[PDB]
Amino acid sequence: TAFTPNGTYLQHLARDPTSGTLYLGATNFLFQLSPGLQLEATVSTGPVLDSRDCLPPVMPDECPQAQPTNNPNQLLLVSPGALVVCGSVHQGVCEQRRLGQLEQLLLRPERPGDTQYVAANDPAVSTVGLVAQGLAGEPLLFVGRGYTSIPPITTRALWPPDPQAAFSYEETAKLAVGRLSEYSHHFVSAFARGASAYFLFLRRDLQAQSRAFRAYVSRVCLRDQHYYSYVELPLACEGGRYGLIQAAAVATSREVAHGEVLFAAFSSAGASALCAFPLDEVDRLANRTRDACYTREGRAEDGTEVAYIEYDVNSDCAQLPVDTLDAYPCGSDHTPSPMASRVPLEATPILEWPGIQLTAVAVTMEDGHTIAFLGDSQGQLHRVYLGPGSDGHPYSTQSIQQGSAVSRDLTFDGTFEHLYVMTQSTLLKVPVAS
Amino acid sequence: XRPRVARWTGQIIYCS
Ligand SMILES: *[C@@H]1O[C@H](CO)[C@@H](O)[C@H](O)[C@H]1NC(C)=O
């Protein structure tokens, strides 16, 4: 019913849907847990000798400033053929390990090049990722990486013909962004739907006179592997009055595996809000943005500006034929890129909690009703009924670890009878009812 | 007013 490793901190949680096995990324530790929260394997991951001025492998002659450094886990994703682990040490290099046999190593390049620094090398920065596959069945890895001290989003080979080139990205398989410390992405999550991959994050809206941080959803084709179809849309949760997106989830349940509505928690720069964003409207507005920037020079039919090129790339919206939309739905070498909407996507809060910083969101369905499991910075887990007639107030609240923020990696078990809830010191298997 | 989630469909009801 609990897992509390004495003397270390938790960072990430992954669940193998085939197996039920849980995987924990911790400071200097990887644990494999059975669904019953029973320990099945441990793997030490640090400390090591490191500096952030230094490139792996770290050696005393080239890096005398090296020092004992802990290894907070930075990414932890289940792949078709392996478990993907990236730490925050050694420039965020990754490895792959056997599913169910966490202790044995499958793949790990012996001399990683500067194209294979995957995760964030600063534990105070986040890394988000998403496994997907190529048109040829190749397995790929989408990675969002916040600014530290490397492109903010990349598509990398998980099992390429040479194993040493693993986790590398091709020259066009990244989002080229210039003033990375000024934009200063903070990633929240990444998810797939249909033919697309999506990234939720925070960055500075340099288009705005105040240059304040702003939440965005962002979309790319899965086959593409080129970022030609990259398009960002700002989020407006009460017009952006709750500006800092913290966590989101799509409904997951025995009836609907993955829902069509994104439930996101936002925080004010204090109070929090829950805001729904229908995914067809998300796709509607990115479609408009792409369509306008391709064929009407970034403008609506009445001439109002609706789309532009972000990230200072030397690209422009154009006057391409309407046929380009059908001939190049995921873009091309010379279509305008990367694109953004001037028009936000709006949501009216379905909750407003005046003294709460939400940090985690899970949503499920019970006999047709939508329930939301919402964690906060204080280590509380709330339960809220989201259907018609709702109070907005939680019908239930439970302390997981006082003072210690609940982790985004809320996950249900295969039957949805339990929620796996995590703080910096403990992981619970919490029943959904009684 | 505030949106709610429609029972069974998960579709969002914008006004109650
Ligand atoms: C978005 O545009 C694509 C065109 O490639 C189309 O397949 C899809 O149905 C569109 N979705 C919406 C919600 O308009």
CA–CA gap between residue A4 and residue A421 (Å, rounded): 12
- Whether A211 is in the pocket of ligand 1, judged by its Cβ within 6 Å, is no
CB contact under 8 A, B12 and A276: yes
A174 closest CA partner among A220, A138, A123, A126: A220
The domain of A105 spans 1-434
Q: Which atom of ligand 1 is nearest to the CA of A326?
A: 5
B2 closest CA partner among A238, A339, A205, A286: A238
CA–CA gap between residue A240 and residue A1 (Å, rounded): 39
- SS3 of residue A154 by DSSP: strand
A200 closest CA partner among A261, A257, A262, A140: A262
CB contact under 8 A, A388 and B11: no
CA–CA gap between residue A344 and residue A336 (Å, rounded): 20
> Are A421 and A411 in contact, with CB atoms under 8 Å apart?
no
Q: How far apart are the first and last CA of chain B?
A: 7
CB contact under 8 A, B3 and A368: no
Residues of A in contact with B13 (CB under 8 A): 388
- Whether A366 is in the pocket of ligand 1, judged by its Cβ within 6 Å, is no
A237 CA to centre of own chain: 19
Q: How many CB atoms lie within 10 A of CB A64?
A: 10
Between A and B, how many residue pairs show a Cβ–Cβ distance under 8 A? 46
CA–CA gap between residue A395 and residue A385 (Å, rounded): 7
- Whether A254 is in the pocket of ligand 1, judged by its Cβ within 6 Å, is no
Cα of B14 from ligand 1 centre, angstroms: 23
CA atoms within 13 A on the CB side of A169: 26
Largest CA distance in chain B: 21
Judge whether A370 is closer than 8 Å to chain B, CB to CB.
yes
Residues 6+ apart with CB under 8 A from A142: A129, A130, A131, A132, A153, A154, A155, A190, A197, A199, A220
As to burial, measured by CB atoms within 10 angstroms (0-12 exposed, 13-18 middle, 19+ buried), residue A21 is buried
CA–CA gap between residue A417 and residue A86 (Å, rounded): 30
* CATH code of the domain covering residue A394: 2.130.10.10
A260 closest CA partner among A365, A417, A144: A365
CA distances (Å), origin A309, targets A52, A182, A216, A232, A300: 33, 17, 15, 10, 15
CA–CA gap between residue A210 and residue A208 (Å, rounded): 5
Residues of A in contact with B8 (CB under 8 A): 368
Q: How many CB atoms lie within 10 A of CB A179?
A: 12
Cα of A291 from ligand 1 centre, angstroms: 10
Question: Determined by which method?
Answer: X-ray
A141 CA to centre of own chain: 12
Residues of B with a Cβ under 8 Å from any A Cβ are 2-8, 10-14, 16
- What is the spatial order of strands in the sheet that A418-422 belongs to? A2-3, A427-431, A418-422, A411-412
- Whether A270 is in the pocket of ligand 1, judged by its Cβ within 6 Å, is no
- Whether A280 is in the pocket of ligand 1, judged by its Cβ within 6 Å, is yes
CA distances (Å), origin A153, targets A224, B8, B12: 14, 36, 31
> Are A394 and A375 in contact, with CB atoms under 8 Å apart?
no
CB contact under 8 A, B5 and A370: yes
Nearest CA to ligand 1 atom 3: A287
DSSP state of A350: S
Residues 6+ apart with CB under 8 A from B9: none
Total domains, chain A: 1
- DSSP states along A166-187: TT-EEEEEE---S-HHHH--EE
Measured CA angle at A263 (ends A308, A82), to 5 deg: 90
CB contact under 8 A, B8 and A260: no
- SS3 of residue A279 by DSSP: helix
- Whether A291 is in the pocket of ligand 1, judged by its Cβ within 6 Å, is no
How many residues comprise chain A? 434
A312 closest CA partner among A171, A181, A143, A176: A176
CB contact under 8 A, B2 and A386: no
Residues of B in contact with A387 (CB under 8 A): 4-7
Query: What is the structure's resolution, reported in angstroms to one decimal?
Result: 2.6
CA distances (Å), origin A116, targets A66, A123, A142: 21, 18, 13
> Are A202 and A212 in contact, with CB atoms under 8 Å apart?
no
> Are A226 and A173 in contact, with CB atoms under 8 Å apart?
yes
Judge whether A278 is closer than 8 Å to chain B, CB to CB.
yes
Rounded to the nearest angstrom, the minimum Cα separation between A340 and chain B is: 26
Cα of A280 from ligand 1 centre, angstroms: 9
Judge whether A279 is closer than 8 Å to chain B, CB to CB.
no
Strands A427-431, A39-44: pairing kind: unpaired
Judge whether A365 is closer than 8 Å to chain B, CB to CB.
yes
As to burial, measured by CB atoms within 10 angstroms (0-12 exposed, 13-18 middle, 19+ buried), residue A13 is buried
